Design a protein around this ligand. Structure first.
Ligand SMILES: Nc1ncnc2c1ncn2[C@@H]1O[C@H](COP(=O)(O)OP(=O)(O)OC[C@H]2O[C@H](O)[C@H](O)[C@@H]2O)[C@@H](O)[C@H]1O
Length: 375
């Protein structure tokens, strides 16, 4: 039983249907999974059954070679006896009344990530169930608006290249599908304040011209500052004494992934510069998403321990490391929120976002997200 049919964009159509994810006319289906890729209850169990042990087997090996996933994550496995080659496994969040927005955030990261994945393997049709709604507790109303919002933003934010044409939104119960069809109906000043007081300023200057107490740079494993365009602009403006200081502070240290080192500002108008070695997008890896949230937390954390009052973040990793810009905007914003609410800060009160005037995708990404957050 089909319900509605909606156009997103030329060639692309969103279809709410009733049906069984096991037997559907699409390239790939999305599984509501957990952190271990274990499929012991729910639909994922329905899927495992039909697929046979092959389905679990690959998962098990995926979990032993890449390790457990975390909420807000998605990977891709063999399908076994299913009418597909692959299943996309989306690990949605567990639902908590207190951490609502972070839950909304992670449910949506999962959906976004799973669209990325299907797009990577060039699929042109996908089936998505109401992830999280079952045994992870996510109230059916918010769950499905979030999924639909996620999908909208996928085609709204960058039209530039897309393999997907058919997105099915599925379930076997009639009410979940009613939700979905209601959800689709509903779905179709750069300055926020978190609960605990700290505010985030959208700012459209070169990072070199920033005037905060702390500024973050993104830099490679051997710490040369001349390579990336962000690093280059700081190097140029500060003086070469920043390269000399950085190489000397990172002397006795086996520079790894998620490494943060502090230097003084020289020519620059800030007091200190935090230099950070950000992870490659690696296709949206679990690691990449941890390590980056961690850097973000550490730089704010450090800053509170220096008793400083303000810090300037650029779109780190959205250049050569290949982070889809929207995903990042929304990664760092969540993290500033999550962090501010959970701590009682004494001196940190202002996170600025420095976006090059000529970087419209980054200006765009952060605006849209700021708009949602003020909405
Ligand atoms: N002057 C500026 N002011 C503000 N933003 C800027 C500026 N210049 C560039 N951006 C934005 O800055 C963003 C980041 O661009 P990238 O410099 O590649 O850093 P990355 O974090 O992607 O990683 C690449 C580096 O790290 C790796 O180890 C590589 O070896 C490189 O050294 C882009 O969105 C720019 O639009």
């Amino acid at each position: 039983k089909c319900f509605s049919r909606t156009v997103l964009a030329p060639g692309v159509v969103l279809i709410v249907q009733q049906g069984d994810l096991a037997r559907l006319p699409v390239d790939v289906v999305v599984n509501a999974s957990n952190e271990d890729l274990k499929h012991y209850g729910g639909l994922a169990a329905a899927l495992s059954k039909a697929a046979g042990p092959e389905l679990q087997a690959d998962c098990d090996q995926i979990v032993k070679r890449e390790g457990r996933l975390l909420p807000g994550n998605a990977t891709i496995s063999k399908a076994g006896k299913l009418p597909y080659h692959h299943v996309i496994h989306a690990v949605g969040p567990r639902w908590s009344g207190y951490e609502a927005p972070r839950c909304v955030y992670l449910l949506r990261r999962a959906v976004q990530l799973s669209l990325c994945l299907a797009e990577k393997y060039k699929y042109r049709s996908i089936a998505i169930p109401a992830i999280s709604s079952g045994v992870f507790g996510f109230p059916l109303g918010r769950c499905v608006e979030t999924i639909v919002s996620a999908i909208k933003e996928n085609f709204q934010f960058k039209k530039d290249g897309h393999c997907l044409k058919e997105i099915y939104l599925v379930d076997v119960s009639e009410k979940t599908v009613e939700a979905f069809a209601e959800a689709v109906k509903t779905v179709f000043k750069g300055s926020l304040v978190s609960p605990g007081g700290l505010q985030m300023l959208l700012v459209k200057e070169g990072v070199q011209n920033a005037k905060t107490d702390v500024v973050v740079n993104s830099v490679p494993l051997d710490l040369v500052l001349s390579r990336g365009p962000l690093s280059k602009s700081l190097l140029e403006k500060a003086g070469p004494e920043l390269q000399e200081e950085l190489d000397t502070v990172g002397q006795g240290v086996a520079v790894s992934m998620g490494t943060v080192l502090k230097t003084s500002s020289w020519n620059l108008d800030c007091r200190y510069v935090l230099h950070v070695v950000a992870p490659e997008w690696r296709n949206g890896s679990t690691s990449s998403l941890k390590i980056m949230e961690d850097i973000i937390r550490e730089c704010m954390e450090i800053t509170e321990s220096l008793s400083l009052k303000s810090i300037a973040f650029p779109a780190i990793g959205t250049g050569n490391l290949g982070f889809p810009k929207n995903i990042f905007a929304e990664l760092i914003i969540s993290e500033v929120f999550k962090f501010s609410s959970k701590n009682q800060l004494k001196t940190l009160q202002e996170v600025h976002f420095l976006l090059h005037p000529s970087d419209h995708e980054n200006i765009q990404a952060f605006s849209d997200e700021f708009a949602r957050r003020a909405n």
